[PDB]
Amino acid sequence: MTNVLIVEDEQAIRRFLRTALEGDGMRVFEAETLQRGLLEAATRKPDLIILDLGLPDGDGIEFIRDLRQWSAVPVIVLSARSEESDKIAALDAGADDYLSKPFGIGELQARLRVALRRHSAPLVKFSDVTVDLAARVIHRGEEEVHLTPIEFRLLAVLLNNAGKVLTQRQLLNQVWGPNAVEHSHYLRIYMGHLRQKLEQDPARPRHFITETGIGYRFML
Amino acid sequence: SHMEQIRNALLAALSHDLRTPLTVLFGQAEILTLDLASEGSPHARQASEIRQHVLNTTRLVNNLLDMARIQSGGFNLKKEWLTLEEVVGSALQMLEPGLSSPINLSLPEPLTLIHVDGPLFERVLINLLENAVKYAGAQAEIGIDAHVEGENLQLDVWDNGPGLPPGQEQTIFDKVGLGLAICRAIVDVHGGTITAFNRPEGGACFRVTLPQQTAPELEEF
Known part of the structure; x- marks a missing residue:
């Protein structure tokens, strides 16, 4: 019912990936190469794609660039060089999530749901704080919290992308624009302001999760 | 050659x-x-x-x-400006779950910007914490204190418990156990140093000092 395409050359990881996904209500296709990977992205049109950046076919970055020109299939990326340049590139060119190359069958199962519930078919509340983008008023414990316009935009970007990582660049361009590619430190400070005013324990966030080297990700 | x-x-x-x-x-x-x-x-x-x-x-x-x-002199180092709160909070999530009590945090100005290679400097916190967790004894009180002395960030990973042998506390960076040594190696490459001392109160403290060229506001808004 929900089909996965495994794009990974190493026969070892693919049998593992196949065996693990097939153990859920889910069937998988495979492709030893970036080329054939793009093919069964047309021939099968899966519900979600898993691709390692290790493929020697030519950097997998442009595979997602291509893929996104027509398709909006969620793409979980596998990072061998778990130094974050690759993972950011992937996430920036359209990827949805990532796993570092030694990973467990939970994180694989988790980050697949979050991107299948995020790709099927108003104003929500996370456990103590009620945010309502309609009127632009936000309660924490039946008490309105006053937020700078910019702070409210940053909250709103996060709030609509629940469960998905956002890189330092995705967040900047959607709060200011392409102006300050380098003046990033404001994103991290404002995110601290959002933390200080909407989190039970700011240094132990439950919703405004830090994803070091990558960016941020809102939860629940 | x-x-x-x-x-x-x-x-x-x-x-x-x-x-x-x-x-x-x-x-x-x-x-x-x-x-x-x-x-x-x-x-x-x-x-x-x-x-x-x-x-x-x-x-x-x-x-x-x-x-x-960091064996190539450490120009594998992408040092962004990070809220100190989120650096600490990121290490906390990676070991505080499977612990008895939380780490005592002491951050006066949490939204300080620190210049570090985020993931590599997260490794420093975890190792300094884990070394406390391994050798300070069950029911130990582990903490983190982060001031600013000059334009140097001072970060202290302290515990009660045995502490170092008084004679040479800066030999302890010589592997029992690595992980201290890995901390030095990583923060050395960052420009700072790491010293260890017994607290007067009792137990060990590990002090990480970093040079901080700026303290960016840089735009005022």
């Missing part, structure tokens, strides 16, 4: 090649672990034990890869 830059990359390369078998091993172990404990299999214990020894292995390798990473 460059016959040690060829050796350095050989270490960095073999370390990177070691992650793909760990992935397969760790994946195949988990599936076994489950498949065997799904059924009524006595060996499920044995699969589970194998899983754990792949974790332990992969940690030892994730330490050996950051090391060879």
